[PDB]
Amino acid sequence: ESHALKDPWFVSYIPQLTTEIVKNNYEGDWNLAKEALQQPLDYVRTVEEFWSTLNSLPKLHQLESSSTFVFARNNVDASYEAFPNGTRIIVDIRKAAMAEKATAVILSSVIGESVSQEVCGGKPICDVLRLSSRPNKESPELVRLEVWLSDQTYGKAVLAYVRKALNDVGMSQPHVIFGESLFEKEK
């Protein structure tokens, strides 16, 4: 007795890219780069499949992979340009011993529709989730989680909800950092 997800999520991994590499090889189109370079993992359709696929991922906090893992609702295009008026919520997890649980909390909150129900009036707004290793000199095991929203007017409220969710299960500054980045600004 599987439990269906509200929507299926297409899960893949992509190599690390840069604006210049995408400009020079993929006509500036990050979605084309993704289509050209991704490897599929699964199209998750049930709660059980979600957990199976998540548990199969590399330990990004142990530098097992340089790839970005993407979860895309209904296989939506995962480029900024496919999110007009959108924003990204960034969650940086500095503490390696918290990365797996933070990832589980954030991904399950969205894929299980808690964010939609509790923040967005039941409308699907969070349509892409990304997960990457992003070490820096201050934080050599940093994992970066991104939540991409189709409508920037929900950004502050989604951030607050996800922050509270993490705080409630033991994860707060300085172990995790939150930010928001409008797609129109970044572009």
- The residues that touch Mg ion, with contacts defined as CB under 5 A, are 42
Residue with Cβ nearer Cl ion (96 or 165): 165
Rg (CA), the chain: 16
Residue with Cβ nearer Cl ion (53 or 172): 172
Contact 144, 79 (CB under 8 A): no
Contact 28, 80 (CB under 8 A): no
Q: How far is the CB of 176 from Cl ion (least distance, A)?
A: 6
Q: How far is the CB of 129 from Mg ion (least distance, A)?
A: 18
Helix %, strand %, coil % of the chain (to 5) = 40, 30, 30
Residue 42's binding partner among Cl ion, Mg ion, none (Cβ under 5 to 8 angstroms by kind) is Mg ion
Q: How far is the CB of 38 from Mg ion (least distance, A)?
A: 16
Grouping H, G, I as helix, E, B as strand and the rest as coil, residue 80 is helix
Q: Please identify which residue in 42, 172, 175, 180 interacts with Cl ion, judged by CB under 5 A.
A: 172
Identity at 71, one-letter amino acid code: F
Residue with Cβ nearer Mg ion (49 or 92): 49
Span of 17-25, 106-114, 137-145, 165-173 interacting with Cl ion by CB under 5 A: 165-173
Residue 173 is a binding residue for Cl ion (CB under 5 A): yes
CB-count burial class (<10 Å; 0-12, 13-18, 19+) for 97: exposed
Residues in contact with Cl ion by the rule CB under 5 A: 172-173
